[PDB]
Amino acid sequence: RGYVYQGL
Amino acid sequence: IQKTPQIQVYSRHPPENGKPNILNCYVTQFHPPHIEIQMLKNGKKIPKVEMSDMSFSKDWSFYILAHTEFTPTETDTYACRVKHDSMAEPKTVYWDRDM
Amino acid sequence: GPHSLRYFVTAVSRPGLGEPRYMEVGYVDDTEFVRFDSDAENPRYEPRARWMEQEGPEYWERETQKAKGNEQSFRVDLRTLLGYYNQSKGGSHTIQVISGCEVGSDGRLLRGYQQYAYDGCDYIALNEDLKTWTAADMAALITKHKWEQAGAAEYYRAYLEGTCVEWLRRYLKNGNATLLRTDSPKAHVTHHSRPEDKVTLRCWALGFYPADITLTWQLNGEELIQDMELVETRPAGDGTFQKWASVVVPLGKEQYYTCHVYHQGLPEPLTLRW
Ligand SMILES: *[C@@H]1O[C@H](CO[C@H]2O[C@@H](C)[C@@H](O)[C@@H](O)[C@@H]2O)[C@@H](O[C@@H]2O[C@H](CO)[C@@H](O)[C@H](O)[C@H]2NC(C)=O)[C@H](O)[C@H]1NC(C)=O
Ligand SMILES: *[C@@H]1O[C@H](CO)[C@@H](O)[C@H](O)[C@H]1NC(C)=O
């Protein structure tokens, strides 16, 4: 399962 | 970054007329990502080509595989035509069954 | 041996043509197993390997929701970077990300990573310590500062040690017949004439898995790595890989050159010649 990416 | 795609065309098994096989067109080392890839049989676009194995290398260039099942015959010829921003015109690479 | 779980993510803007194209492609080792493409007719996370048929409908629903949320967040990132770099809204730009974890044969975490690139250039990356980030330029430094105040590294590290490693173990277990197999390379040598009484000898290695392989050419028992020509190992459309390496030799002396193939599926390396 993938990660929930954080905003740049 | 502008990196021109490397286009490689090859079959899964050494070709034997009359025997099912898989033709591959691997387009690599390109950037930007927008790109058009068509597999052609006797100059005509092959329908339902499957796109897979998309990825990028350490230098971020893109890699992607186009493939389709096919049974080689003595007369049929195949090629892969690619359109990408790094090339003024489309590039066509023909399958060389004797390579 | 060791195994990996990797996710290749790409967000690409296209001003005047709608929303950015967003894509996620997942791999367990060298096998593609899941994918999300925002340009599909009805965007959903989809299985790319046969053994993923073992996950229930909840898996797909949850991964699809996560992907749609990631898609929106990346849409925002694209705009944010336009500001960081003072670029126009009319051009296409690209964000790329590679995230993953590797475990040893015992299933314990070996390493984890996450790297970002903007327009094909390094942007920000997680250090091996899994605690700090390294920024390639001043724009990425802004992101680094935001991530430090938010505890982003700690959150990613929890994902690595928890979710990443545990699902990687589960994928290896469920797709064991596929992921833990070894397909032995089958090799051949082709011969092509050249001008100047020289010949091109090409050694092929076909139908193998995993992708790691070594093909060399020898003469007098020494590797001709220097003058060797070849292609990066490549997928052949059915879950296996192929590769070739060639050397130019003097006509009439092809018999002194030997191709050597080393792979996990070859108890004893292969040795061939024209
Ligand atoms: C892959 O592993 C299976 C055992 O694992 C099965 O059960 C769960 C772990 C689940 O992940 C499921 O997907 C998976 O198929 C091996 O099969 C078992 O083999 C043992 C002997 O080694 C037999 O006693 C079991 O009856 C048999 N289970 C079943 C249901 O067939 C399988 O051999 C292995 N595949 C390969 C080629 O290594
Ligand atoms: C920002 O970019 C514009 C072009 O869109 C340029 O004219 C301007 O000088 C730049 N300003 C800054 C903050 O560097």
> Could you tell me the resolution of this structure in angstroms?
1.9
- The answer, yes or no, to whether C and B have at least 3 beta-carbon pairs within 8 Å is yes
CA separation, residue C118 to residues B58, C39, C67 (Å)? 13, 21, 20
Closest CA to C129 of C113, C106, C148, C108: C113
Which of A1, A2, A6 is nearest residue C152 as measured by Cβ atoms?
A: A6
- What residue has token string 């194995």? B53
DSSP chain C: --EEEEEEEEEE--TTS-SPEEEEEEEETTEEEEEEETTSSS---EE-SGGGGGS-HHHHHHHHHHHHHHHHHHHHHHHHHHHHHT--SSS--EEEEEEEEEE-TTS-EEEEEEEEEETTEEEEEE-TTSS-EEESSHHHHHHHHHHHHHTHHHHHHHHIIIIIHHHHHHHHHHTHHHHT--BPPEEEEEEEEETTTEEEEEEEEEEEBSS--EEEEEETTEE-GGG-EE---EE-SSS-EEEEEEEEEETT-GGG-EEEEE-TT-SS-EEE--
CATH of C1-181 among 3.40.50.720, 3.40.190.10, 3.30.500.10, 3.20.20.100: 3.30.500.10
Question: After what residues is chain B interrupted, C–N > 2.5 A?
Answer: none
Smallest CA-to-CA distance from C32 within B96, B50, B2, B83 is with: B50
Distances from the Cα of C257 to the Cαs of C6, C205, C206, C231, C244, in angstroms?
A: 39, 17, 20, 20, 15
Domain with CATH 2.60.40.10 in chain C: 182-273
- Assess whether the previous peptide bond of C210 is cis (omega < 30° from 0): yes
Say which DSSP state B76 is in: -
C7 near A CB under 8 A = yes
Contact present, C20 and C14 (Cβ < 8 Å): yes
Q: Write the DSSP symbol of residue B62.
A: E
Q: Which atom of ligand 1 is nearest to the CA of C176?
A: 1
Experimental method: X-ray
Domains of chain B: 1-99 (2.60.40.10)
Q: Given CA atoms C75, C77, C83, C85 in this order, what sign does their dihedral have? A: negative
Query: Across the interface, do B14 and C119 touch by the CB < 8 Å criterion?
Result: no
Number of Cβ atoms within 10 Å of the Cβ of C87 = 12
Pocket of ligand 1 contains residue C177 by CB under 6 Å: yes
Residues linked to residue C188 through DSSP beta bridges, in sequence order = C204
Q: Locate C6 and state its tokens.
A: 């990797």
Which sign does the torsion angle of CA B28, B32, B34, B40 carry?
negative
CB contact under 8 A, B52 and C32: yes
Distance CA B26, CA B65 (A): 4
Angle among Cα C130, C32, C62 to the nearest 5 degrees reads: 70
Q: Which CATH superfamily is domain C182-273 in?
A: Immunoglobulins (2.60.40.10)
User: Which residues of chain C form CATH 3.30.500.10?
Assistant: 1-181
